Amino acid sequence: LLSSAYVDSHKWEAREKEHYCLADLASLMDKTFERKLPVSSLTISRLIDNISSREEIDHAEYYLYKFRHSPNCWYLRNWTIHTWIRQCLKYDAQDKALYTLVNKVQYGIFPDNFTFNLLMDSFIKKENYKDALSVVFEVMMQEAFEVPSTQLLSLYVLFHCLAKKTDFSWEEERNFGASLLLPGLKQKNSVGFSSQLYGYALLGKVELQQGLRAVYHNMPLIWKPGYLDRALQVMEKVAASPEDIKLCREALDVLGAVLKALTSKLVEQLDIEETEQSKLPQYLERFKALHSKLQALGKIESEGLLSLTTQLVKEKLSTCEAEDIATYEQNLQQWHLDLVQLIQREQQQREQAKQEYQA
Amino acid sequence: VRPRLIAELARRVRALREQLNRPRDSQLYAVDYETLTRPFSGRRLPVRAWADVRRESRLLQLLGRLPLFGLGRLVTRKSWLWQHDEPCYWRLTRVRPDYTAQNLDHGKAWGILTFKGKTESEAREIEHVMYHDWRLVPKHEEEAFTAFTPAPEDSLASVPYPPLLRAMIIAERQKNGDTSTEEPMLNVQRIRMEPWDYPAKQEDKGRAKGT
Amino acid sequence: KAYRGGHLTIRLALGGCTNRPFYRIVAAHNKCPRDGRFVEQLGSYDPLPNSHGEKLVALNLDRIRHWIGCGAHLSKPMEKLLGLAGFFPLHPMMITNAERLRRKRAREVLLASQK
């Protein structure tokens, strides 16, 4: 879905690179780890920069693991992560990039939005929507929906996957609900509000059937009950919204199906508060009333979610890509400056050590 | 006095061996969830914590899944959420992960504390980092989570003296010629009763010794 | 003698004989034995009623105030005794135990009425 200019690798190929043999840097890091001493971020940056084969990706994965479990794990630089993902894409190793992204705790791979988009678009271009969905879920887990391009791409992938899904595990429901709620909240259009309602419906089904802890545990979600009430609040907000804002019929149908299926361990809530299972009937009544209201005002969209998202993408992704490319240009320049500063510090320290030793 | 040099040697050697064989957080604060005992010492945890130990997450179990170990993010605690209605949280400023942990789920943290809606001026070390009591505030919820309107905190400005002490004060005044009819009064404006669950100074806290 | 840490506390040292207790209010190091070395004797307490049906308590209020101002702690029975004297507020546990006794006797009276 992204243009050739966005995914072009020429300018990262053109970065100033100081060449080393990966074996030498690997041996130096091995000796440093044997001595129980900290390895510099510059060393791992050089190691990742000098991947020249698919087997060197296997070696660099191990050394990324080792650096993550070292005293200077915090100092892994952003350009190193970007270069790792670039190398993985270059040498047909998207599986390794996805493995390191999924196990980000063990490898410290926390990409920026541009790198998420690169990986997601590679998977989309190769029609591997399962791995694209995995990347979208990883974006959700890191709460990296701060850039419009990532939001649009994730919404497209999520709706494409949902259009062909019937059997839902509650873990899958939770993941889909979070991954559609987070980008939907940042888009003030019909697609965004429909995504909000759909995700709230899914999360509310999970809350009612499996409990609220199943919803908020290890997720970027709040620990307050009332997700179905929040869906109904989205409906009410759309009722008082400007004309252009509408709601897809599919999202409303999903919410209705959830409510119709719901109306047919430690206690976390205060006993004085009314439980959601006791509020299901009034939720159903409110849903019916608000559905009739929205139908009356003509605030219901008949186009499917996937088609609407496709149209919105074709309308906005070009400008989003332009902005992202400019930010990427700026980031590359700043990364070059920082790397040169690190190299200078390392060289100054070595020469000073030499003037110490000559005495 | 006949010098005791073996004592000097023993103390120095023990100090060196304790400084070089330090047990790490991953070893000290590991827990066997089936028996809820510490493998390092074998001591079982108190009963009232058991459920939490099996349900909630340690702070760095959350931070190790975030970029930069979640610097600048807001982290709250389950116990604070249950006990207090006003917002309580830490704004992280510095994190020192325990690299020896497989999942990087042990370590130390520093931040700015806000307790019951009152923010502190400086950043200090966070206590109970290893407790299974921690929750991460979502970014899209922070604005709603941090919202707080400071209610009027008007408490008693003074209290009566105890009966006998009041009588003694009045008797002393009358003996010294004072005939004032004003009641003796104890000022309690300078006594701020801090809630027992407020974070203490982790910098002053000790550490389990290696054995 | 040097104790590792510790602090001064005003407490009751038990003397007398078997089945006849008597207490000396003393300010002493918390680590010292109950009836051992003390810094100063600050009073006395006879818990057995005398021929007049009275429990006699002697309190050196000046020295008690001095030692409290010097950083001395207080044992819980001393807090209760000083609350009874009116020198301190009544300790919360005296109030709570009084309420518990009231409820227990109310239950007993209700049992009698039910019978």
Binding site: V267, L270, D271, I272 | W82, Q83 | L101, R102, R103, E108
Partner: peptide, 30 residues
């Protein structure tokens, strides 16, 4: 106590509660 605080305590001490005590007798029962 307010009802909300009592409910908070009941949640805090789930499964380890006694019967709630009302106001005590005003005078000492005879």
């Amino acid at each position: 106590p307010p009802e909300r605080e009592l409910s908070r305590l009941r949640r805090l001490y789930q499964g380890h509660l006694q019967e709630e005590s009302g106001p005590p007798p005003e005078s000492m029962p005879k």
